[PDB]
Amino acid sequence: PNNRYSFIGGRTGQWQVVKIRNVLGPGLQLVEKVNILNGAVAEIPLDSAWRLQGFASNIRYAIRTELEALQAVVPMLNRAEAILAVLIPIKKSAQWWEMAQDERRDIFERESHHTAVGLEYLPGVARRLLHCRDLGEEFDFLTWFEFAPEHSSAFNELLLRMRASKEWEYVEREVEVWLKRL
């Protein structure tokens, strides 16, 4: 449908905030709930603390054989069992964005094995990647993960592996918003 998603932190919404972890750089204000809208929001209610937005876009790095591997195991969003979610806004450094395409692909997969590592956690973890640097937002990406509680430990292990990678040496802001489906 609409390629735009808005995440409004405040007092209403479909998701309850469990905790907010300020991984790197300035964090996000603590709020009660997150309201997720499949569209752009002009202004947020007075009782909202922040608004995040991003759009779904085309593939930027993954190659055909990687997409085939993902498609064989990828789970759908909105599984009945997937009552936990994590929203992770990420900003990468200017030095990352000034690099050419071969340099960034080399770091993303040849050195960091982003997709190969991520594949190990499917189909337990469902995901949605949104882009927002081109919208002028404070973050460059909004990443969304959801899973049943049984996979919480596996997801924490994934996070540890990702943040140890060469790719994460270019991450300059990151926040984790942990959520429970209402």
Next chain:
Amino acid sequence: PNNRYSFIGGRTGQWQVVKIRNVLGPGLQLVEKVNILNGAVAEIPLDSAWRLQGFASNIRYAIRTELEALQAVVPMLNRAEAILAVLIPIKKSAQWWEMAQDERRDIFERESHHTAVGLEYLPGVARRLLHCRDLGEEFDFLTWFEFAPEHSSAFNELLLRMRASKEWEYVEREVEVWLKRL
């Protein structure tokens, strides 16, 4: 800095329309002038026939050696002598966008030599690429070229070569707006 540009076809603007060539698919209404703004415009003005918008973004295909060659030879915009320009909005097919990154890169450069051929013409041609598929626009890209009249025949030769390329088999809408500086 603002990464957004709007092109408004209508009665006023910095560029006078010389001709519009509706190359492929639905065309653009003939107008007297094109007004170019470095920002977003909420609505299409009353006296305007169309409003196109796009954003400047990061590199998607060019590799380091290609980028070095491009950045070293491309002219600046708004040269005294560059009184001719061409605005070429382009839309690619759904089949293009569903391909993986290696598939699209291979078509763009390996099979079509987009950058290698373009570099032959770039010394006299200033260029700006803007993206707009992610904005929900009716085109996917807005391409902008400007040059002195002495290079008109060379630019037409470049267009002849690119429209014969494998990449152009995926172009499904294309309009040429030829302009003269006011």
